[PDB]
Amino acid sequence: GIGVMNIMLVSVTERTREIGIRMAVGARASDVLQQFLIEAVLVCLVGGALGITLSLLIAFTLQLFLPGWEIGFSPLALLLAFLCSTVTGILFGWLPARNAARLDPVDALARE
Amino acid sequence: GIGVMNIMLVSVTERTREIGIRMAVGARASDVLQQFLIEAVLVCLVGGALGITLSLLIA
Amino acid sequence: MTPLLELKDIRRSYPAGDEQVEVLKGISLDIYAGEMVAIVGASGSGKSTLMNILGCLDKATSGTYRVAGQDVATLDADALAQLRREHFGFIFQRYHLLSHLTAEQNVEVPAVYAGLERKQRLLRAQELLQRLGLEDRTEYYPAQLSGGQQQRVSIARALMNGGQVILADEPTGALDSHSGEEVMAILHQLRDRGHTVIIVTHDPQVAAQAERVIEIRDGEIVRNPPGWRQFVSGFNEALTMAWRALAANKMRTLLTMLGIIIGIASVVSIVVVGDAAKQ
């Protein structure tokens, strides 16, 4: 999951002029970290939903193979996986968008 | 390691005009696949060297 | 005698509404060495696309555009690129170049596709730079370079091929008439060098510099008034190109390589340790 941070870093890097027009409309320096990190953890959670979905697919897949082996749901582990996806999400998205918060609108606009 | 492909895809996506100036100087269609894939596997091998190095550190 | 180019009744057409439009119609043209031809005409007339024929970017599927007496229709597009190394040395208004390379490398590139020792062609390139009057600028990034000098780099870049044929997108339009028409005078020098050159412009004024204006409209001219070696050299030279591309993103490279490193290190780790406890 770590490289996703690199991905987002790239995406934001692409947004540099967009970052400048957003600061141009008076966005708070926090706000970019907000929206970006939220999008990142969003990806983490939707990927966690499709992920747990596929995991359940594997679960029934193992219901298909029952040499006495038995399925058993552990919902607490499910929610822990969710929160884990979340904390990894903030863990990855925090710093780069913090650096984005560091940025001046000026350089984000005038630069070519 | 799979996301590295996404990374390279992005990089090349950035290179679009560079791709055009390279085709402009008569590069073969194979040649871009050559240089790019070679660069990728290069990253794989240097990361494999530092990786095995760290693994030995663990050893 | 026979002109090195023979564009007779050649025309492109491209689909729109699932039918090809009249971007071009049958045109007769012939070209000698040393020609300095303007491409005057309305913008979007496909005279740019016609230049793409001149660039052999695509077959027109009509006429017989006989480069050196050889029609474009016969040869491979890769063979057309071989012709490009053999002849063509294109130059644009936007002076496109890698931000990556030093200008010497930006000139270096076309001959890389040729099979040749690097140092020799580097010396040739330095000769091309002194021909540009440029020397100190050699190590600079194009971003570090002034635009007219960058265009000069496009010229030397054309020159490394020998510049036997030269298309030219708006040579002076990106900048002042000073350095612009100056470079145009260098174009007159290459004309004096006898290599064929062909500027393209909708502007008559810059076209006045050319010895042969030719106006096109409605798809036709309204008038014509006068090796594995490079694979291993690819390995090391694009090794350097790789180092530079990584230099473009050392941090991204860092996260990427780390993603590799932790992986493989963990591989050998668990393999060896599990094998050892197993022992």
Q: What does the DSSP assignment read for C209-226?
A: TSSB--EEETTEEEE---
What is the C-alpha separation between C260 and C268, in angstroms, rounded? Answer: 13
CB A100 within 8 A of CB A32: yes
- Give me the count of residues in chain A: 112
CA distances from A79 to A52, A76, B38, C17 (A): 10, 5, 42, 54
Q: What does the DSSP assignment read for A29-70?
A: HHHHHHHHHHHHHHHHHHHHHHHHHHHHHHHHHHHS--SS--
What is the C-alpha separation between C128 and C134, in angstroms, rounded? Answer: 9
Cβ atoms < 10 Å from Cβ of C214 = 22
Pairwise CB contact (< 8 Å): A7 & B7 = yes
Residues 156-185 of C with CB under 8 A from B: 157
CB A4 within 8 A of CB A92: yes
CB C61 within 8 A of CB C20: no
CB C155 within 8 A of CB C183: yes
What is the C-alpha separation between C279 and C274, in angstroms, rounded? Answer: 8
Cβ-in-10-Å burial (0-12, 13-18, 19+) of B11 comes to buried
Residues contacting residue B41 through CB under 8 Å, at least 6 positions apart: none
Residues contributing to the annotated binding site of C for ATP: 41-48
Query: Would you say residue C267 lies in a domain?
Result: no
Query: Would you say residue C247 lies in a domain?
Result: no
Residue owning tokens 């439009």: C21
Query: Would you say residue C260 lies in a domain?
Result: no
Query: Would you say residue C251 lies in a domain?
Result: no
What is the C-alpha separation between C3 and C35, in angstroms, rounded? Answer: 11
Pairwise CB contact (< 8 Å): A3 & C251 = no
Cβ-in-10-Å burial (0-12, 13-18, 19+) of B35 comes to buried
* Amino acid sitting at position A15: R
List CB contacts (< 8 A) between B10 and chain A. 7, 10
CB C123 within 8 A of CB C108: no
CB A100 within 8 A of CB A33: yes
Query: Gaps in chain C (C–N > 2.5 Å) come after which residues?
Result: 226
Question: DSSP code of B11?
Answer: H
**H helical segments located in B1-59:** 3-14, 16-24, 29-58
Joined together, the tokens standing for residue A59 give 């679960």
Strand partners, C216: C41, C221
Q: How many domains does chain C have?
A: 1
Query: Would you say residue C63 lies in a domain?
Result: yes
What is the C-alpha separation between A22 and A64, in angstroms, rounded? Answer: 53
CB C61 within 8 A of CB C7: no
Residues contacting residue C18 through CB under 8 Å, at least 6 positions apart: none
Pairwise CB contact (< 8 Å): C258 & B47 = yes
List CB contacts (< 8 A) between A2 and chain C. 255, 258-259
Query: Would you say residue C210 lies in a domain?
Result: yes
Q: What are phi and psi of C4, to 5 degrees?
A: -65, -25
Query: Would you say residue C265 lies in a domain?
Result: no
Question: End-to-end alpha-carbon separation of chain A, Å?
Answer: 32
List CB contacts (< 8 A) between A7 and chain B. 3, 6-7, 10
Residues contacting residue C267 through CB under 8 Å, at least 6 positions apart: B55
* Subunits with 3+ C-beta pairs closer than 8 A to A: B, C
Residue C67's region, left for phi above 0, alpha for psi from -120 to 50, else beta, is beta
Q: What does the DSSP assignment read for chain C?
A: ---SEEEEEE---EESSSSEE-S---EEEEE-TT-EE---B-TTSSHHHHHHHHTTSS--SSS--EETTEETTTS-HHHHHHHHHHTB--B-TT----SSS-HHHHHHHHHHSS---HHHHHHHHHHHHHHHT-SGGGGS-GGGS-HHHHHHHHHHHHHTTT-SEEEEE-TTTTS-HHHHHHHHHHHHHHHHTT-EEEEE-S-HHHHTTSSB--EEETTEEEE----THHHHHHHHHHHHHHHHHHHHTHHHHHHHHHHHHHHHHHHHHHHHHHHHHH-
- To one decimal, the resolution in angstroms is 3.3
Q: Residue C115, CB half-sphere, CA atoms under 13 Å: how many?
A: 6
What is the C-alpha separation between C73 and B5, in angstroms, rounded? Answer: 38
Q: Is B48 on the interface with C (CB under 8 A)?
A: yes
What is the C-alpha separation between B7 and C100, in angstroms, rounded? Answer: 18
Q: Is A7 on the interface with B (CB under 8 A)?
A: yes
CATH number at residue C189: 3.40.50.300
**Residue in C229, C193, C185, C233 with CA at minimum distance from that of residue C209:** C185
What is the C-alpha separation between A31 and B45, in angstroms, rounded? Answer: 40
Query: Would you say residue C243 lies in a domain?
Result: no
Cβ-in-10-Å burial (0-12, 13-18, 19+) of B7 comes to buried
Residues contacting residue C206 through CB under 8 Å, at least 6 positions apart: C170, C171, C172, C173, C180, C184, C199
Joined together, the tokens standing for residue A40 give 């990142």
* Subunits with 3+ C-beta pairs closer than 8 A to B: A, C
Q: Which of B14, B55, B56, B57 to mutate to test the interface with C (most CBs of C within 10 A)?
A: B55
**Quick one: closest CA in C to A9, which residue?**
C252
Q: Is C227 on the interface with B (CB under 8 A)?
A: no
What is the C-alpha separation between C60 and C12, in angstroms, rounded? Answer: 4
Cβ-in-10-Å burial (0-12, 13-18, 19+) of A94 comes to middle
What is the Cα Rg of chain C in Å? 24
- Give me the count of residues in chain C: 279
Q: Residue A84, CB half-sphere, CA atoms under 13 Å: how many?
A: 11
Instruction: Find the Cα–Cα–Cα–Cα dihedral B29, B32, B34, B37, rounded to 10°.
Output: -130
Q: Is C266 on the interface with A (CB under 8 A)?
A: no
Cβ atoms < 10 Å from Cβ of B30 = 9
Question: DSSP code of A99?
Answer: H
| DSSP3 helix / strand / coil % (chain A, rounded to 5) | 80, 0, 20
**What residue numbers bound the domain in which C81 lies?**
5-235
Residues contacting residue C139 through CB under 8 Å, at least 6 positions apart: C102, C104
Strand partners, C41: C216
